[PDB]
Amino acid sequence: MVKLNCRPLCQAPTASRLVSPPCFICRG
Amino acid sequence: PQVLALEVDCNIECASLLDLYGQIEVSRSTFTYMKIADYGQLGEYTCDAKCDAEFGEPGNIRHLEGKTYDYRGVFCFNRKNLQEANYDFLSFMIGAAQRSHRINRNQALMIGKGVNEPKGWLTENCFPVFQTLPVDVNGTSTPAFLAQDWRRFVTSFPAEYGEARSVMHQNVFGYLAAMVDANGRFLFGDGDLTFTPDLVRERIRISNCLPDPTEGNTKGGTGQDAFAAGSFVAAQAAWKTAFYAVEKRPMFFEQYEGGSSAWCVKYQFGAEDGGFVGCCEHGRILQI
Amino acid sequence: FFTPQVLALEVDCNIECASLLDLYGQIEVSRSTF
Amino acid sequence: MNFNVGVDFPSFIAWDGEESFPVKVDGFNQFGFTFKTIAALTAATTFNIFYHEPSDADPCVPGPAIRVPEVPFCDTVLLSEDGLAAVTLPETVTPDSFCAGTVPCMNGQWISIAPATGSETNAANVQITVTMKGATR
């Protein structure tokens, strides 16, 4: 029957972060 | 009222983790084969002054077997936001079905949960897993991955097995090529603003729907992004003997006469194939 | 998504009066006053 | 055989008798107006148009209500003393006769209508909503 369908009008796209390899201190 | 001819889609495909496995064909829906478990001890250096002999312990043997599996969809219609004319939505459904079949087949063969599925070699947990070493920093042993580790993982494979390639996500390779040393230099290949070695020589096949421990590059880590404990980082195997994919019948499609009352045209389709693992020893998985 | 097809068409239902003009006398002046 | 005529031309409440509602037309390029009455009118009524910008606090909510300036066409005979756009519903409109309107100059990201002061008691018996034409995204 009536399958009421949706879509978005707007949204609030944030800023995904960006972490990259920190320096390695040393094992030990 | 000036409709164009562009049909921008923006949908992604996985990698094809199938050509690596052992491809096999069979008509029947149930196959079987032999296995040599372990030859076993069959003697000892008999000491001197003894024309006698000795016994001991031979090795077991197992004629194993497996089955195939099915994947079938019905998809009916009504025929007047249809056959009249906007677009052959039928062909849209056919292409979507083929794409779905490929992607779900790959996902299954990767993670197939036992019952009625090829048992996913990931969830099998019988491939050896190598958790990585924790990393002390500012008085905190926070889990993290470090260049040598990767190398130590790829070199720790038993060489006498044979050529074992590796599999990983593009996020992991991006995290890897962005390794920086204490001298702020780009720890790995360095001095070209990037790092593009041909992975075929570096025996690495890349994928994009692997478990991606570096989720959208967000999961990295110093204290909150932390790479997170036990998370599939990568894998490595001689896939020509580690896993196997058996192919029985491709996708097929046909009109279902009956039930179709000249408006609800009901189409029926499906496919049959399966997969299994070899001995899950030729290959390991790098995890946190 | 479909294109409903347009056809030949003229529906008007607009009416007018009669013409009580020929009955009156006809004058054809060239200037503006007579 | 009525099509799903809501997946295009989506309508949203603009004035439910006693409350306005800012509506986002950014995704759309064209949007009209539908006025309806629910009872008998007494005198003519007037309405002022407003528009809203993305609030600095949130890029997905309407800001304040800035008045909309009237753009004149050709063959215009009168301009609102303020120069701001506005609409008016004349007296003697029976409540089974819809009314349409459209400003040809969009500005902002949200639109809104308000009952012009002194003509707001009859506004209760007035209903206003808006449909659109676009998606663009």
Rg on CA atoms of chain A, Å = 22 Å
Choose one word for the global shape of chain A: elongated
Largest sheet of chain B: 5 strands, mixed
Q: Level of helix content of chain B?
A: 10-25%
Give a count of the beta strands of chain A, DSSP E runs of length 2 or more: 0
Structural class of chain B: alpha/beta
Structural classification of chain A: little secondary structure
Distance between the termini of chain A: 66 Å
Protein name (chain C): Major capsid protein
Protein name (chain D): Virion-associated protein
Organism (chain D): Agrobacterium phage Milano
PDB class: virus
Describe the protein:
The structure is cut from a larger assembly and holds one copy of chain A (28 residues), two copies of chain B and one copy of chain D (137 residues). Chain A has 28 residues and is mostly loops. The N and C termini of chain A lie far apart (66 Å). In chain B, strands 1, 4, 5, 10 and 11 form a five-stranded mixed sheet that branches. A five-stranded mixed sheet of chain B has the order 6-12-9-7-8. In chain B, strands 2-3 form a two-stranded antiparallel ribbon. Chain B is of the alpha/beta class and 288 residues long. In chain B, strand 7 (165-169), helix 3 (170-177) and strand 8 form a beta-alpha-beta unit. Chain D is mainly β and 137 residues long. Chain D has strands spanning 12-16, 23-24, 34-37, 45-52, 66-67, 86-89, 99-100, 110-115, 126-130. In chain D, strands 2, 4, 5, 6 and 8 form a five-stranded antiparallel sheet that branches. A four-stranded antiparallel sheet of chain D has the order 1-9-3-7, with no helix packed on it. The relative contact order of chain D is 0.39. Chains in contact: A-B, A-D, B-C. Chain B: This is Major capsid protein.
